[PDB]
Design an enzyme around this catalytic site. Structure first.
Site, PDB file in Angstrom:
ATOM      1  N   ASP A 254     -59.578  37.432   0.614  1.00 40.73           N
ATOM      2  CA  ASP A 254     -58.536  36.650  -0.040  1.00 40.73           C
ATOM      3  C   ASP A 254     -58.585  36.771  -1.561  1.00 40.73           C
ATOM      4  OD1 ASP A 254     -57.298  33.226   0.528  1.00 40.73           O
ATOM      5  OD2 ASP A 254     -56.271  35.143   0.222  1.00 40.73           O
TER       6      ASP A 254
ATOM      7  N   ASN B  24     -69.311  36.877   5.920  1.00 42.87           N
ATOM      8  CA  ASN B  24     -68.298  35.837   6.013  1.00 42.87           C
ATOM      9  C   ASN B  24     -67.121  36.275   6.874  1.00 42.87           C
ATOM     10  OD1 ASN B  24     -66.992  33.204   4.853  1.00 42.87           O
ATOM     11  ND2 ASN B  24     -65.476  34.819   4.496  1.00 42.87           N
ATOM     12  N   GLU B  25     -66.867  35.510   7.933  1.00 46.20           N
ATOM     13  CA  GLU B  25     -65.734  35.727   8.833  1.00 46.20           C
ATOM     14  C   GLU B  25     -65.564  37.163   9.342  1.00 46.20           C
ATOM     15  OE1 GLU B  25     -62.395  32.352   7.785  1.00 46.20           O
ATOM     16  OE2 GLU B  25     -62.487  34.118   6.483  1.00 46.20           O
TER      17      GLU B  25
ATOM     18  N   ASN C 158     -65.596  28.255   9.820  1.00 42.96           N
ATOM     19  CA  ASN C 158     -64.420  28.162   8.963  1.00 42.96           C
ATOM     20  C   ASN C 158     -63.208  27.775   9.795  1.00 42.96           C
ATOM     21  OD1 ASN C 158     -66.106  28.976   6.943  1.00 42.96           O
ATOM     22  ND2 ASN C 158     -65.028  30.893   6.485  1.00 42.96           N
TER      23      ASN C 158
ATOM     24  N   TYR D 151     -59.333  25.775  10.349  1.00 42.30           N
ATOM     25  CA  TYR D 151     -58.066  25.445   9.705  1.00 42.30           C
ATOM     26  C   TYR D 151     -57.032  24.962  10.713  1.00 42.30           C
ATOM     27  CZ  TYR D 151     -59.945  27.939   5.659  1.00 42.30           C
ATOM     28  OH  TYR D 151     -60.722  28.346   4.599  1.00 42.30           O
TER      29      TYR D 151
ATOM     30  N   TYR E  20     -52.828  26.828   9.786  1.00 43.43           N
ATOM     31  CA  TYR E  20     -52.385  28.119  10.302  1.00 43.43           C
ATOM     32  C   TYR E  20     -51.901  27.979  11.740  1.00 43.43           C
ATOM     33  CZ  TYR E  20     -54.697  30.172   6.224  1.00 43.43           C
ATOM     34  OH  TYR E  20     -55.074  30.501   4.943  1.00 43.43           O
TER      35      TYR E  20
ATOM     36  N   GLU F 220     -65.809  25.789   5.645  1.00 50.30           N
ATOM     37  CA  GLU F 220     -64.458  25.935   5.116  1.00 50.30           C
ATOM     38  C   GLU F 220     -63.464  25.064   5.864  1.00 50.30           C
ATOM     39  OE1 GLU F 220     -62.520  29.581   4.295  1.00 50.30           O
ATOM     40  OE2 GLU F 220     -64.289  30.601   3.494  1.00 50.30           O
TER      41      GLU F 220
ATOM     42  N   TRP G  74     -62.891  23.756   1.346  1.00 56.62           N
ATOM     43  CA  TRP G  74     -62.317  24.958   0.757  1.00 56.62           C
ATOM     44  C   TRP G  74     -60.975  24.616   0.119  1.00 56.62           C
ATOM     45  CZ3 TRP G  74     -64.477  29.542  -0.160  1.00 56.62           C
ATOM     46  CH2 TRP G  74     -63.650  30.614  -0.516  1.00 56.62           C
TER      47      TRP G  74
ATOM     48  N   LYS H 184     -55.810  26.065  -2.176  1.00 58.68           N
ATOM     49  CA  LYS H 184     -56.577  25.162  -1.330  1.00 58.68           C
ATOM     50  C   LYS H 184     -57.627  24.393  -2.117  1.00 58.68           C
ATOM     51  CE  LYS H 184     -56.245  27.441   3.183  1.00 58.68           C
ATOM     52  NZ  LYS H 184     -55.558  28.650   2.649  1.00 58.68           N
TER      53      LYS H 184
HETATM   54  C1  LIG Z   1     -52.475  32.410  14.169  1.00 60.98           C
HETATM   55  O1  LIG Z   1     -51.915  32.021  12.923  1.00 60.98           O
HETATM   56  C2  LIG Z   1     -52.256  32.868  11.836  1.00 60.98           C
HETATM   57  C3  LIG Z   1     -51.432  32.460  10.610  1.00 60.98           C
HETATM   58  C4  LIG Z   1     -51.971  33.290   9.449  1.00 60.98           C
HETATM   59  C5  LIG Z   1     -53.486  33.206   9.175  1.00 60.98           C
HETATM   60  O2  LIG Z   1     -53.786  34.211   8.234  1.00 60.98           O
HETATM   61  C6  LIG Z   1     -54.225  33.726   6.981  1.00 60.98           C
HETATM   62  C7  LIG Z   1     -54.361  33.461  10.442  1.00 60.98           C
HETATM   63  N1  LIG Z   1     -55.756  33.155  10.068  1.00 60.98           N
HETATM   64  C8  LIG Z   1     -56.879  32.764  10.770  1.00 60.98           C
HETATM   65  O3  LIG Z   1     -56.772  32.606  12.036  1.00 60.98           O
HETATM   66  C9  LIG Z   1     -58.207  32.532  10.143  1.00 60.98           C
HETATM   67  N2  LIG Z   1     -58.290  33.059   8.663  1.00 60.98           N
HETATM   68  C10 LIG Z   1     -59.358  34.186   8.399  1.00 60.98           C
HETATM   69  C11 LIG Z   1     -59.191  34.791   7.050  1.00 60.98           C
HETATM   70  N3  LIG Z   1     -59.117  33.704   5.870  1.00 60.98           N
HETATM   71  C12 LIG Z   1     -58.910  34.343   4.416  1.00 60.98           C
HETATM   72  C13 LIG Z   1     -57.588  35.026   4.057  1.00 60.98           C
HETATM   73  C14 LIG Z   1     -56.388  34.322   3.989  1.00 60.98           C
HETATM   74  C15 LIG Z   1     -55.139  34.900   3.655  1.00 60.98           C
HETATM   75  C16 LIG Z   1     -55.094  36.257   3.366  1.00 60.98           C
HETATM   76  C17 LIG Z   1     -56.280  36.996   3.418  1.00 60.98           C
HETATM   77  C18 LIG Z   1     -57.504  36.419   3.751  1.00 60.98           C
HETATM   78  O4  LIG Z   1     -55.965  38.297   3.095  1.00 60.98           O
HETATM   79  C19 LIG Z   1     -54.521  38.420   3.068  1.00 60.98           C
HETATM   80  O5  LIG Z   1     -54.048  37.056   3.019  1.00 60.98           O
HETATM   81  C20 LIG Z   1     -58.140  32.485   6.257  1.00 60.98           C
HETATM   82  C21 LIG Z   1     -58.452  31.932   7.608  1.00 60.98           C
HETATM   83  C22 LIG Z   1     -53.775  32.636  11.603  1.00 60.98           C
END
Ligand SMILES: CO[C@H]1CC[C@H](OC)[C@@H](NC(=O)CN2CCN(Cc3ccc4c(c3)OCO4)CC2)C1
Ligand SMILES: CO[C@H]1CC[C@H](OC)[C@@H](NC(=O)CN2CCN(Cc3ccc4c(c3)OCO4)CC2)C1
Lengths: 596, 596
Positions: free
Chosen positions: B165, B407-408, B461, B463, B467, B499, B544, B563
């Protein structure tokens, strides 16, 4: 005293800039009594040097604290420094500093924007660690520069009052260091550059050296010898020169050397070959008509206050370069010395201001502004001392093309002309090279001001359409021009508008173009520009302000002064692009045609 | 390599951290061919060190530049350094850095958050000035930590893409310095503090005698000796100790000295006597149950990027102290050592993370995350190397109570366990003192994750309600609670929520309490807190994020990640007061008791 900026050839400095010192408040005012510099600070916390102390801890009671604060730090002294002269120098402690080494008081200063050093060799042993304790005071009275008023209530709590806009940030705002010199050392140097029309140029010098026969060498950008001189006194070598110009900012390196029977000391000094002088309604730089564009600035940033930072200096100069600013003014206090070194290098014109702001009562107060209450002879002396120290520091900087004795003093009371006449005379005695000016407040117009004749360039702070005529662009244009023309028909001096701007909330948009809106700022600046281009005597425009800065709490200030072109985190308002179109759209240094 | 942070007794550094260096872009990639370190950088501009190079010049093309950049600076070597060991050390050059002294290549490094030094003694002469040229590269591939992908368009223009991110800031982010040691110097030290149940404690040491007989002395805060030891290693003296506890942070000073036949080298090492251990679902500090509160942070600031700054550090710890945070986690890369020295002093618990983030593909790309293309054996080698350099640096910090390997990462493909099992083993071999963890991403839940058993503490982590189940607090509460209980009945490990947070626009207010509003952030965080207090295995909560930080451009990121509890200029959102009320309202360090 004599002042010279430390360098490295046979001299060596160690920055005690390391951020973290020990910090403590002296709420009960015991510190000097209980000899706090003798032992380690009790109930202390880490603080960053350089930087204001008010905002570092997110505490309200600390931010608005007035009185004494204590700095303390241990340091190991370099081994190869034995039998050498060791100097302790602060680039600035804001307001007042008292230094002790171990237990030995070695320093004292009033003036928070100029440096002060002291030979500390006998109180220090190489290879050993010593304790450095500083006592900082942020109190302002009527004999300080700037002036203030402290109020002690029934509860014994001090509360500072001042008469300027910007916030009273304090602490060690700049570079701390030990540095060494041979026991035959150079403590002073002076340079004056004469240039003709336009073939060649001469350079005078005058410098004092502790034990030492003096040679001087004028070196080029290639470190090659272009001229040489003998003796301590005046040299005057001629050259077919590359001039110091606002576009390039070419620089020579005068290498001055001091030889003893046993020791030798070398010192490189940056030199720019240019002449500044007023001729009628024009401001001549190297015998060429110049037009000032730029800003009134402020040493202000989000978390460090007035504390200096390299990153901030690079970014702020990138924006001014981008926006077309060819000049600026060290608004309301001497700036960090590194700021002027940048200006020398990049050919940036600088109007140098003293910390002489707040000579006003209008906006339990004294009835007479110029009297034994309020401003008096002691105040005049501190002002004189302040004018000295700035020139003793900045006389050798090519970027400085003007001196500014004070900012917006009320010249309506009786003592006004009696006070400023000695100062304006004494200043021209201290430096015949650069013209001097005094910045003029609004309500002191062409028919009321009593001091504008004693200076070379007329600097005006105007706000028609804001404080007055508020909201009326039609009337403000009429009043401004008539006021500018009145000033023209009176003094026939060069006129620079050193402050013009309106409060603008970023993100506030309006279809009606009313006050506090970004639309208004653009429209308001536009009207001023049209007036400027219709008056020949106007040879400068410096927008107020560069960025939003902090102020004391009030109903007139929405979280600080919002007259900035950029926000405090340096984001551009719509007016930034307007100023960018104008300043880069004109021929460099050359004024706009009278309707063109 | 062996790594010790420089100090001062017979060791002496000159911080050449001083900001201004020459900067240049190498868009055409000529620099290495044309040997730019031979001459002064052509077409250069001033840049601040330390600090990211992306934002310093307000230029977009410099901000999003990928490739090689060149740093350059001249420096005078101290005179009293002759016949001493001279080292040139960078605290961090982000991603790649190659150093030259004059024309002599001396250094090379991959890893942008750990230091790398080199002996430059034979290539340097005291009293003389030398030219230092650094080549910094910001390119990420599948063998870099973190991983990335470069995309070259039809025109041959590089454009970096990554899977995390935070924004890919680069440049010299931390301290550059030269420092000295006797030719007999201490090169490594390692301390392990065992404590019995709070009456007395033993302290193991092991140190590497670069060249000398080794003696050790354990001093307290009063500078008096409490224990002594002899010989190169293998001491284990008992003490009646003031323990290093969260909140207080008491520290001893282990003095390690190394005597040759002619020379002696002293090294002060701060030591904190505490024990870290997992016992069932509990995280024990000094054999007492502890409860993590605090933040996931970021080395991010408005103009310096990830560049370090003291003022920023002091202010940020003032905010975390005020809000009640007793801990944090170095999110997604090793932080500056000065952050851990602070944590040691003030008794702050820290989860130490490697830069191993972006081991994900989910949220022309490879189809298999764990394959020769993508994440392979070379990556595992670079990852192991990253864990090495991190532990070799931070092993002696009492504040660090846990290592975090990644991480993740996506643990759904097959090779996931084949990749992480060796790493988790190698990590526990490098430091048996602290538990190890791996931060778990959302879509790898209790029934999907394949690797969480290889680690001691469960870091999640989550959310829910953002999301997924977007905006629904009732459904999110059910899913969260059900998910936490599933994790409990599966691993029976201590669970820390590392997170949880939602994007919040400061100033956006809503009566309907919907997403992106300050009201929602409060309601969302509060709901999560209710669940935490209903689950016994939960022993930590880290919001976070601390502050809004910068990211790569996208439709999910409104000018970066919002955030944060604080804005990027460190202004508090409504949620800051909510967390301050919870964290300062609970008894220090103790899980809410159901919990009021
Ligand atoms: C199923 O719904 C989707 C909606 C979009 C989320 O992507 C951020 C998806 N994210 C996750 O399930 C868990 N994430 C892992 C990565 N994390 C960091 C991140 C968050 C946003 C980003 C990014 C990296 O690179 C490009 O944009 C946020 C939490 C879920
Ligand atoms: C409606 O007429 C009044 C309205 C208020 C203006 O500022 C006080 C007055 N001032 C001026 O016209 C010229 N000033 C001189 C001082 N200058 C700096 C300043 C501005 C605001 C301040 C302050 C100092 O201290 C307390 O709040 C702004 C321009 C005029």
């Amino acid at each position: 005293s004599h002042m010279l900026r430390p360098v490295e050839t046979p001299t060596r400095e160690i920055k005690k800039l390391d951020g973290l010192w020990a910090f403590s408040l002296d709420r009960e005012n015991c510190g000097i009594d209980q000899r706090w510099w003798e032992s380690a600070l009790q109930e202390s916390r880490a603080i960053a040097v350089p930087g204001s102390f008010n905002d570092q801890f997110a505490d309200a009671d600390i931010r608005n604290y007035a009185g004494n604060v204590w700095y303390q730090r241990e340091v190991f002294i370099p081994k190869g420094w034995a039998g050498q002269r060791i100097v302790l120098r602060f680039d600035a402690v804001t307001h007042y500093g008292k230094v002790w080494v171990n237990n030995q008081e070695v320093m004292e200063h009033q003036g928070g924007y100029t440096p002060f050093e002291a030979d500390v060799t006998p109180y220090v042993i190489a290879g050993k660690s010593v304790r450095i304790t500083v006592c900082v005071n942020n109190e302002l009275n009527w004999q300080t520069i700037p002036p203030g008023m402290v109020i002690t209530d029934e509860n014994g709590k001090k509360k500072q009052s001042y008469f300027h806009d910007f916030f009273n940030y304090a602490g060690i705002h700049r570079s701390v260091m030990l540095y060494t010199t041979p026991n035959t050392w150079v403590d002073d140097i002076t340079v004056v550059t004469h240039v003709a029309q336009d073939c060649n140029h001469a350079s005078v010098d005058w410098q004092v050296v502790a034990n030492g026969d003096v040679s001087v060498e004028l070196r080029d950008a290639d470190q090659q010898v272009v001229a040489t001189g003998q003796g301590t006194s005046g040299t005057l070598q001629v050259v077919n020169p590359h001039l110091w110009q606002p576009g390039e900012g070419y620089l020579y390196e005068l290498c001055v050397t001091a030889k003893s029977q046993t020791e030798c000391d070398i010192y490189p000094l940056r030199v720019g070959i240019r002449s500044v002088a007023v001729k009628g309604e024009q401001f001549l730089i190297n015998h060429k008509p110049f037009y000032f564009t730029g800003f009134g600035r402020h040493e202000d940033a989000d978390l460090r206050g007035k504390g200096f930072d390299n990153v901030l200096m690079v970014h702020d100069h990138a924006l001014m370069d981008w926006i077309g600013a060819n000049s600026y003014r060290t608004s309301h206090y001497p700036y960090a010395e590194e700021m002027l070194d940048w200006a020398d290098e990049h050919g940036i014109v600088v109007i140098d201001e003293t910390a002489a702001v707040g000579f006003n009562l209008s906006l339990n107060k004294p009835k007479e502004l110029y009297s034994e209450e309020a401003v008096n002879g002691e105040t005049q002396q501190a002002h004189l001392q302040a004018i000295k120290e700035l020139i003793a520091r900045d006389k050798n900087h090519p970027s400085v093309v003007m001196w500014s004795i004070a900012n917006e003093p009320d010249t309506r009371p009786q003592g006004a002309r009696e006070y400023f006449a000695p100062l304006a005379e004494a200043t021209r005695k201290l430096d015949p090279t650069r013209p001097i000016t005094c910045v003029n407040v609004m309500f002191c117009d062409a028919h009321t001001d009593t001091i504008s004749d004693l200076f070379d360039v007329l600097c005006l702070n105007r706000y028609y359409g804001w404080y007055v005529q508020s909201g009326d662009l039609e009337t403000a244009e009429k009043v401004l021009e008539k006021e500018l023309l009145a000033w023209q028909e009176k003094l026939h001096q060069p006129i620079i508008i050193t402050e013009y701007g309106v409060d603008t909330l970023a993100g506030l948009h309006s279809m009606y173009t009313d006050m506090w809106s970004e639309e208004y700022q653009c429209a308001w600046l536009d009207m001023y520009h049209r007036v400027f281009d219709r008056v020949s005597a106007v040879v400068g425009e410096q927008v107020w302000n560069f960025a939003d800065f902090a102020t004391s709490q009030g109903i007139l200030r929405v979280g600080g002064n919002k007259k900035g072109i950029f926000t405090r985190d340096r984001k551009p308002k719509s007016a930034a692009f307007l100023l960018q179109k104008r300043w880069t759209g004109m021929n460099f240094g050359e004024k706009p045609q009278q309707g063109g």
